[PDB]
């Protein structure tokens, strides 16, 4: 129940404002900046502000804060969803999200803001559907918005019917300083770029554990996805009935399903780091990386970030494989490895100086995060079984998909 | 890469080296530094802070950083321990009561993991009174032979006369430089 | 299939060596298609096994079945899920339609000795589907 | 070629489940 959706800037200036109900005065935006400054300076800053009887709930963008003022007991989740949809629409329409496009795309920005939400209730949020009625370079609105299928425009025709899938894995490990992993969860991400002719009804089928148990084949390798979040095109009723994933893919790249299940296996990359930091004399970084993944998979672009001292200077790196560079901007040692074959072991011996004068305040111990990305390796073991592409006209589709294994929240707690 | 310029510089002398001047107050450290740099016994007030100078001998710039022996300046020797290659210890054989304090200070300064490449340089200062010990009694009392991984050398230098300064400089050059 | 013919003798020898009663990860061949075994493919595989021998009358074992499924997946890209038998006790029919192989008693269904037996009626009659309509959807 | 694993063709349905 937002009252006025406005876009701020880094200096407190409102780049663009669009009131939807008019119950909140436009002058309340000026007090948002002082309120945010006071909250940040006292540790009480939150995404949802409160200027008397008006609440300023907004998120932080790349360069401006999309604060949406409200007065009644409006749904905070609804406001956040509307802000996320607006950000996604802006990203789809404008390649950059900064002040350079706010002051240059006002003619289309105002129209998009007016069409997106009326009276504080959003009605259209699909960038592909919205691009057929609001352009910066007007016909009647498309029937897709009025029709039930609001995520697949009818009449799309292509020379070929090729759909590219992307089974991107997210290996997140929360390893404590004692050496044990506390939060070790892998979140799947099935992103597909559907490019076909017409409005095909995709019938996604994988080796799900529940599906295998229902069919009676609960004995082979099945992915045990604890949480499965289907897209808007995916029919919730069909999935709830008999695990049938039937939905119409959209035109372009979109996220169909987002699996999320816990992982009880050993980490793909094991980092054994030591800190022989002398008392204002020197420091030693005996960091050893052990690859627990399969030898057939190579972790391309392996970047194990080792947090070095903030005031360290004149550092020396004695490693074995991969270039080690210290970035003063980040205040950490970037153990960058181009190719990391499975089962490899890289040993590094850091050595940096330290000023004689002790620091005035503590700096903390940021966790060590690895950036391993091993392609063609599915940690969860989930493999796509079938993709039922059915069209009324009748055509031979050529579906494709690739499995990518990367590191998500794979941080290692320091000592 | 090419190292022709480095070879040309080394053909006529390129190494300079460094040195440290630490010890108890009134131990002849300032007078020793003045004699090494100038060659005269200059009377100076107690070193509240520190004195930094350089000595040119044998084509090596022997930079000397005098450090006072004051109680408020005794724990300040760690400031000069950074980017330090040498260390010279000035003993006070004329102060029997201060000999233990000087030995304790030397042991504390020698028990640091950062100052490891600095070889020992014991200078017998105030070598003009009959109460001054020899070059072995002072070392035996200080236990210089028990300093593992430390290259120490005891040399007796007279502040008023200046004898033994050349021998100490030659020993320091031989310990620092390992060439012909 | 020259590759299938070559792998049949080695697969049969490995199955015979394994009695009737280390590397982590799931590598995937780049560009190798992966899909469930088809009824026609299952029928062709059953016919080839019957002609070459080594599968009809062999003692059914978990290790031998797993090795055969792995070899079939390696040589054809078929998922090792179509080689399922109906629950016992008694004669177990193939779960996937078109399979000509079935398990029959040779003497709790788990302790009963079972052996692979060729059955051409399996490729035409959905015995597994009829026995377990719920499992067939 | 493509970084992150080469794209592989997908099936149409579970042919082994009828
Ligand atoms: N007359 C005489 N006095 C000496 C001799 N050797 C050491 N001293 C005494 O040692 C003191 C040396 O002080 P400085 O040269 O100013 O520097 P320092 O040795 O670091 O002493 P502080 O400045 O107090 O730390 C003099 O004041 C002398 O009293 C010596 O050979 N003859
Ligand atoms: Mg002095």
| Token code pair at residue A260 | 């999320």
Nearest-angstrom CA–CA distance, C49 and A120: 68
**By CA distance, what is A282's nearest residue in B?**
B114
Q: What are phi and psi of C72, to 5 degrees?
A: -65, -45
Residue A27, Cβ neighbours under 10 Å: how many?
A: 7
Ligand nearest to the CA of B41: 1
Residue nearest to atom 1 of ligand 1 (CA): B160
Breaks (C-N over 2.5 A) in chain A follow: 137
Task: Name residue A288's beta-bridge partners.
Answer: A272, A347
Is there a contact between A1 and A75 (Cβ–Cβ < 8 Å)? yes
Q: Do D13 and A386 touch (CB under 8 A)?
A: yes
Q: What are phi and psi of A262, to 5 degrees?
A: -70, 155
Q: What are phi and psi of C56, to 5 degrees?
A: -80, 120
Give yes or no for residue B27 CB within 6 A of ligand 1.
Answer: yes
Please tell me what DSSP assigns to residue A377.
B
Which ranges of A187-294 does DSSP label H, i.e. alpha helix? 209-215, 236-242
Q: What's the gap in Å between B61 CA and the centre of ligand 2?
A: 20
Residue A285: which of A415, A155, A141 has the closest Cα?
A415
3-class DSSP state for residue A210? helix
Instruction: Give me the residue from D3, D4, D13 closest to A388, CB to CB.
Output: D13
3-class DSSP state for residue B102? helix
Q: Do A356 and B79 touch (CB under 8 A)?
A: yes
Is there a contact between A142 and A135 (Cβ–Cβ < 8 Å)? no
Ligand nearest to the CA of B46: 1
| Nearest-neighbour CA in chain D from C108: distance (Å) | 27
Task: Name residue A271's beta-bridge partners.
Answer: A289
Task: Name residue B35's beta-bridge partners.
Answer: none
Nearest-angstrom CA–CA distance, A171 and A165: 19
Nearest-angstrom CA–CA distance, A167 and A349: 36
Q: Do D8 and C81 touch (CB under 8 A)?
A: no
Residue A385: which of C37, C73, C26 has the closest Cα?
C37
Q: What's the gap in Å between B43 CA and the centre of ligand 2?
A: 9
Nearest-angstrom CA–CA distance, A129 and A153: 7
Q: What are phi and psi of C8, to 5 degrees?
A: -60, -45
Tell me whether B43 touches chain A (CB under 8 Å): no
CA B89 vs CA A12, A87, A229, A289, B153: distances in Å: 63, 69, 74, 45, 10
3-class DSSP state for residue A188? coil
Q: 1-18 in D: which are within 8 Å (CB) of A? A: 2-15, 17
Q: Do A383 and C34 touch (CB under 8 A)?
A: yes
Residue C113: which of C61, C42, C71, C69 has the closest Cα?
C61
**CATH class of the domain at A269-375:** mainly beta
| Token code pair at residue A201 | 């009804």
| Token code pair at residue B178 | 């390992």
Residue A34, Cβ neighbours under 10 Å: how many?
A: 11
Using a threshold of 3 CB pairs under 8 A, tell whether chains A and C touch: yes
| Nearest-neighbour CA in chain C from A268: distance (Å) | 9
Helix, strand, coil in percent for chain D, rounding step 5:
15, 10, 70
| Sign of the Cα pseudo-torsion (A140, A142, A145, A147, in order) | positive
Q: Do C137 and A215 touch (CB under 8 A)?
A: yes
Note the Cα C32 to chain centre separation in Å.
21
Is there a contact between A318 and A350 (Cβ–Cβ < 8 Å)? yes
In this structure, the strands spanning A398-407 and A373-375 are antiparallel
> What secondary structure does DSSP assign to C12-49, as a single string?
HHHHHHS------S-B--TT---BPPPHHHHHHHHHHH
The burial class, CB within 10 Å (0-12 / 13-18 / 19+), for A258 is middle
Header resolution in angstroms: 20.0
Nearest-angstrom CA–CA distance, B8 and A383: 68
Long-range contacts of B98-101 (CB under 8 A, 24+ apart): B98/B24, B99/B141, B101/B24
Q: What are phi and psi of A302, to 5 degrees?
A: -80, 125
| Token code pair at residue A159 | 């020379």
| Nearest-neighbour CA in chain C from A228: distance (Å) | 22
The answer to the question of whether B170 is labelled as a binding residue is no
- Over the Cα atoms of chain A, what is R_g? 26
Give yes or no for residue B139 CB within 6 A of ligand 1.
Answer: no
| Token code pair at residue B153 | 């050398």
The vertex-A263 CA angle with A415 and A372, nearest 5°, equals: 60
The vertex-B49 CA angle with B43 and B52, nearest 5°, equals: 75
Tell me whether A351 touches chain B (CB under 8 Å): no
> A4-131 and A269-375: same fold?
no
Is there a contact between C94 and C102 (Cβ–Cβ < 8 Å)? yes
Is there a contact between A405 and D8 (Cβ–Cβ < 8 Å)? no
Instruction: Give me the residue from C28, C33, C136 closest to D17, CB to CB.
Output: C136
Active site residue B82: no
Tell me whether A266 touches chain C (CB under 8 Å): yes
Please tell me what DSSP assigns to residue C108.
-
Among the four given CATH numbers 2.30.40.10, 3.20.20.70, 3.20.20.105, 3.30.450.60, the one describing domain A4-131: 3.30.450.60
Give yes or no for residue B29 CB within 6 A of ligand 1.
Answer: yes
Prior bond to A83 cis, omega within 30? no
Method: cryo-EM
The vertex-A123 CA angle with A118 and A128, nearest 5°, equals: 125
CA A254 vs CA A164, A231, A338, B16: distances in Å: 11, 9, 30, 67
Tell me whether B81 touches chain A (CB under 8 Å): yes
Tell me whether C36 touches chain A (CB under 8 Å): yes
| Token code pair at residue A172 | 């997140």
The burial class, CB within 10 Å (0-12 / 13-18 / 19+), for C40 is exposed
Nearest-angstrom CA–CA distance, B23 and B77: 10
Phi-psi region of A100 (alpha: psi -120 to 50; beta: other; left: phi over 0): alpha
- Counting every residue written for chain B, the total comes to 180
The residue to which tokens 């640091």 are assigned: B112
Nearest-angstrom CA–CA distance, C26 and A232: 31
Residue A69: which of A28, A36, A15, A30 has the closest Cα?
A28
| Token code pair at residue A297 | 């998979």
Task: Name residue A186's beta-bridge partners.
Answer: A171, A261
Tell me whether B112 touches chain A (CB under 8 Å): yes
3-class DSSP state for residue C7? helix
E strand or H helix that includes residue C115: strand C114-118
Nearest-angstrom CA–CA distance, A251 and A132: 13
Q: Which residues of A touch D9 (CB under 8 A)?
A: 398-401
> Strands (DSSP E) along A80-159, which ranges?
117-118, 121-122
Catalytic residue, from B70, B85, B155, B175: name it: B70
3-class DSSP state for residue A221? coil
Q: What's the gap in Å between A41 CA and the centre of ligand 1?
A: 57
Residue B172: which of B66, B38, B62, B77 has the closest Cα?
B62
Which ranges of B17-150 does DSSP label H, i.e. alpha helix? 29-37, 96-110, 137-142
Residues 6+ apart with CB under 8 A from B124: B91, B93, B132, B133, B135, B138, B154, B155, B156, B157, B164
Residue nearest to atom 5 of ligand 1 (CA): B126
Nearest-angstrom CA–CA distance, A350 and A348: 6
Torsion angle of alpha carbons A210, A214, A219, A223, nearest 10°?
A: -20
Nearest-angstrom CA–CA distance, C129 and A55: 61
| Token code pair at residue A359 | 């620091």
Nearest-angstrom CA–CA distance, A83 and A61: 10
Is there a contact between B66 and B29 (Cβ–Cβ < 8 Å)? yes
3-class DSSP state for residue A281? coil
Instruction: Give me the residue from C28, C84, C132 closest to A376, CB to CB.
Output: C28
Nearest-angstrom CA–CA distance, A283 and A306: 13
Q: Do A297 and C27 touch (CB under 8 A)?
A: yes
Buried b (16+ CB within 10 A) or exposed e, B105-128: bbeebbebebbeebbbbbbbbbbe
Nearest-angstrom CA–CA distance, B48 and B66: 11
Residue C67, Cβ neighbours under 10 Å: how many?
A: 16
> Strands (DSSP E) along A149-251, which ranges?
162-175, 181-187, 189-195, 201-206, 227-230, 245-247
Residue nearest to atom 27 of ligand 1 (CA): B26
Q: What are phi and psi of B91, to 5 degrees?
A: -90, 160
In this structure, the strands spanning B89-92 and B60-67 are unpaired
Please tell me what DSSP assigns to residue B120.
-
- Counting every residue written for chain D, the total comes to 18
Is there a contact between B112 and A281 (Cβ–Cβ < 8 Å)? yes
Q: Do A356 and B78 touch (CB under 8 A)?
A: yes
Chains touching A, CB cut-off 8 Å, 3+ pairs: B, C, D
Nearest-angstrom CA–CA distance, A135 and A155: 19
Residue A368: which of A414, A300, A302 has the closest Cα?
A414
Residue nearest to atom 7 of ligand 1 (CA): B28
Residue C13: which of C71, C70, C54 has the closest Cα?
C54
Between the two ends of chain C, the Cα-to-Cα distance in Å is: 33
Mutate to test the pocket of ligand 1, among B23, B24, B30 (most ligand atoms within 8 A of CB): B30
Which ranges of A6-105 does DSSP label H, i.e. alpha helix? 29-42, 76-93, 99-102
Task: Name residue A257's beta-bridge partners.
Answer: A190, A230
Residues 6+ apart with CB under 8 A from C125: none
> Strands (DSSP E) along A267-394, which ranges?
269-272, 282-291, 302-306, 313-319, 323-327, 332-337, 345-353, 368-370, 373-375, 384-390
3-class DSSP state for residue A58? strand
Residue A138: which of A107, A167, A183 has the closest Cα?
A107
The burial class, CB within 10 Å (0-12 / 13-18 / 19+), for A152 is buried
The vertex-A235 CA angle with A230 and A241, nearest 5°, equals: 100
Instruction: Give me the residue from A164, A385, A403 closest to D5, CB to CB.
Output: A403
Between the two ends of chain B, the Cα-to-Cα distance in Å is: 26
The burial class, CB within 10 Å (0-12 / 13-18 / 19+), for A221 is middle
């Amino acid at each position: 129940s937002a009252s006025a959706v406005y876009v701020l800037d880094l200096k407190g200036k409102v780049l663009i404002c669009r009131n939807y109900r008019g119950d909140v005065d436009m002058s309340e935006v000026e007090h948002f900046m002082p309120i945010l400054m006071e909250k940040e300076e006292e540790g009480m800053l939150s995404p949802i502000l409160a200027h008397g009887g008006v609440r300023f709930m907004w998120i932080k963008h790349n360069n401006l804060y999309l604060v949406a003022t409200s007065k009644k007991n409006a749904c905070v989740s609804l406001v956040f969803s509307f802000l996320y949809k607006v950000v996604q629409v802006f990203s789809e329409y404008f390649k950059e999200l900064e002040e350079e496009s706010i002051r240059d795309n006002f003619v289309i920005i105002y129209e998009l803001l007016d069409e997106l939400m009326d009276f504080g209730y959003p009605q259209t949020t699909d960038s592909k559907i919205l691009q057929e009625y609001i352009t910066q370079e007007a016909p009647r609105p498309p029937a897709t918005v009025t029709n039930a299928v609001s995520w697949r425009s009818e009449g799309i025709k292509y020379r070929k019917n090729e759909v590219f899938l992307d089974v991107i894995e997210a290996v997140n490990l929360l390893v404590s300083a004692n050496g044990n992993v506390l939060r070790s969860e892998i979140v799947g991400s099935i992103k597909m770029r559907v490019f076909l002719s017409g409005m095909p009804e995709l019938r996604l089928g994988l080796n799900d554990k529940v599906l295998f148990d229902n069919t009676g084949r609960g004995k082979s390798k099945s992915v045990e996805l604890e949480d499965v979040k289907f897209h808007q095109c995916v029919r919730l009723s069909r999935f709830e009935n008999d695990r049938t994933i039937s939905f119409i893919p959209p035109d372009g790249e979109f996220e169909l399903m987002s699996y999320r299940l816990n992982t009880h296996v050993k980490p793909l990359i094991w980092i054994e780091s030591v800190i022989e930091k002398h008392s204002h004399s020197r420091i030693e970084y005996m960091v050893k990386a052990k690859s627990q993944f399969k030898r057939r998979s190579t972790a391309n672009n392996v970047e194990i970030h080792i947090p070095v001292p903030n005031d360290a200077d004149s550092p020396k790196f004695k490693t074995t494989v991969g270039s080690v560079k210290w970035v003063p901007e980040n205040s950490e040692i970037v153990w960058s490895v181009k190719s990391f074959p499975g089962g490899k072991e890289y040993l590094m011996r850091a050595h940096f100086g330290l000023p004689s004068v002790e620091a005035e305040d503590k700096e903390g111990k940021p966790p060590i995060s690895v950036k391993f990305e091993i392609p063609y390796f599915t940690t969860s073991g989930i493999q796509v079984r079938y993709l039922k592409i059915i069209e009324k006209s009748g055509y031979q589709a050529l579906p494709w998909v690739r499995y990518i294994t990367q590191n998500g929240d794979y941080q290692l707690r320091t000592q | 890469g090419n190292i022709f310029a480095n070879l040309f510089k080394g053909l006529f002398g390129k190494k300079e080296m460094r040195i440290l001047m630490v010890g108890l107050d009134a131990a002849g450290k300032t007078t020793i530094l003045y004699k090494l740099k100038l060659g005269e016994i200059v009377t100076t007030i107690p070193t509240i802070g520190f004195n930094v100078e350089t000595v040119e001998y044998k084509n090596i710039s022997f930079t000397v950083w005098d450090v006072g022996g004051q109680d408020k300046i005794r724990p300040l020797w760690r400031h000069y321990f950074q980017n330090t290659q040498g260390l010279i210890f000035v003993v006070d054989s004329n102060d029997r009561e201060r000999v233990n304090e000087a030995r304790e200070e030397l042991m504390r300064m020698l028990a640091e993991d950062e100052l490891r490449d600095a070889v020992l340089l014991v200078f017998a200062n105030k070598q003009d009174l009959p109460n001054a010990m020899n070059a072995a009694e002072i070392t035996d009392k200080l236990g210089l032979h028990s300093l593992r991984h430390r290259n120490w050398y005891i040399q007796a230098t007279c502040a008023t006369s200046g004898d033994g300064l050349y021998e100490g400089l030659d020993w320091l050059s031989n310990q620092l430089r390992n060439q012909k | 299939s020259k590759s299938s013919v070559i792998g049949w003798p080695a697969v049969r020898e490995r199955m015979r060596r394994a009695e009737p009663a280390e590397e982590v990860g799931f590598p995937v061949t780049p560009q190798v298609p992966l899909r469930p075994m088809t009824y026609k493919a299952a029928v062709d595989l059953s016919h080839f096994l019957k002609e070459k021998g080594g599968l009809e009358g062999l003692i059914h074992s978990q290790r031998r079945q797993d090795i055969l499924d792995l070899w079939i997946y390696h040589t054809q890209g078929y998922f090792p899920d179509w080689q399922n038998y109906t629950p016992g006790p008694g004669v177990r029919y193939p779960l996937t339609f078109g399979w000509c192989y079935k398990l029959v008693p040779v003497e709790d269904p788990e302790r009963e000795v079972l052996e692979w037996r060729f059955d051409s009626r399996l490729a035409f009659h959905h015995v597994a589907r009829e026995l377990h309509p719920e499992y067939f959807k | 070629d493509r970084k992150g694993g080469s794209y592989s063709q997908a099936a149409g349905s579970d042919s082994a489940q009828s």
